[PDB]
Design an enzyme around this catalytic site. Structure first.
Site, short mmCIF file in Angstrom:
data_model
loop_
_atom_site.label_atom_id
_atom_site.label_comp_id
_atom_site.label_asym_id
_atom_site.label_seq_id
_atom_site.Cartn_x
_atom_site.Cartn_y
_atom_site.Cartn_z
N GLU A 28 0.83 -1.21 0.00
CA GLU A 28 0.00 0.00 0.00
C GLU A 28 0.86 1.25 0.00
O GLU A 28 0.60 2.18 -0.74
CB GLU A 28 -0.94 0.05 1.21
CG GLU A 28 -2.13 -0.87 1.09
CD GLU A 28 -3.09 -0.52 -0.06
OE1 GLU A 28 -3.17 0.66 -0.52
OE2 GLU A 28 -3.77 -1.44 -0.51
N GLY A 87 -5.30 2.45 0.89
CA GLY A 87 -4.81 3.77 1.27
C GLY A 87 -3.82 3.73 2.43
O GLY A 87 -3.84 2.83 3.26
#
Ligand SMILES: CCNC(=O)Nc1cc(-n2cccn2)c(C(=O)Nc2cccnc2)cn1
Length: 187
Positions: A28, A87
């Protein structure tokens, strides 16, 4: 928000008990640097496995924005790190500690979070002729079980893939626990 992620982490990051989710945390963060490369603003990404159970991801991009909203007093950096490709705020929520260092517009900026909670405001910590973003995080040992350490071959396999799927980007992988290093780049 951060409490939702902390209560049902598997839902956001993947399985917390077999190393999958643990390594997704790294990916991520890397995807953020890759996005900065795809925008044509980052040429090199460095992923470092430290010997203190943390990973750092460094890029040479433009830097996460550091401006402050004058009425709110909160930096853009903090918004990015705290608000809900899952995210970086998920990674933050699920780290016992996360350090953000941004080199931008001639200044070094730094902020520390614990379990996603900022410990003090983003602050200037020096000057610099470089640009980029560094995220270093220590995964939550309340979240992750069985596999709580980063494993070189998992990162190496996926980083190599990311380098050939984003041709022209240089990705270095460095392991401080044994001095192992790789350089992934494709033309
Ligand atoms: C180690 C992880 N790397 C990482 O997060 N890199 C990163 C991220 C950026 N942003 C992502 C969301 C908002 N900014 C930006 C970014 O878009 N910066 C930016 C872009 C345009 C104007 N001012 C700042 C640059 N680099």
């Amino acid at each position: 928000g951060l409490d939702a992620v902390r209560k049902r982490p598997g839902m956001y990051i993947g399985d917390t008990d077999d190393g999958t989710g643990l390594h997704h945390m790294v990916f991520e963060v890397v995807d953020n640097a890759i996005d900065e490369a795809l925008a044509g603003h980052c040429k090199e990404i460095i992923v470092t496995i430290h010997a203190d159970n943390s990973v750092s991801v460094q890029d040479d991009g433009r830097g996460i924005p550091t401006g402050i909203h004058p009425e709110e007093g909160v930096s853009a950096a903090e918004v990015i790190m705290t608000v809900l490709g899952v995210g970086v705020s998920v990674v933050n929520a699920l780290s016992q500690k996360l350090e953000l260092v941004i080199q931008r517009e001639g200044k070094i900026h730094r902020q520390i979070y614990e379990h996603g909670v900022p410990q003090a405001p983003l602050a200037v910590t020096g000057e610099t002729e470089k640009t980029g973003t560094m995220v270093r995080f220590w995964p939550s040992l309340e979240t992750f079980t069985n596999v709580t350490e980063f494993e070189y071959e998992i990162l190496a396999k996926r980083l190599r893939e990311l380098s050939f799927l984003n041709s022209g980007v240089s990705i270095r992988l460095r392991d401080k626990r044994d001095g192992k290093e790789d350089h992934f780049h494709y033309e």
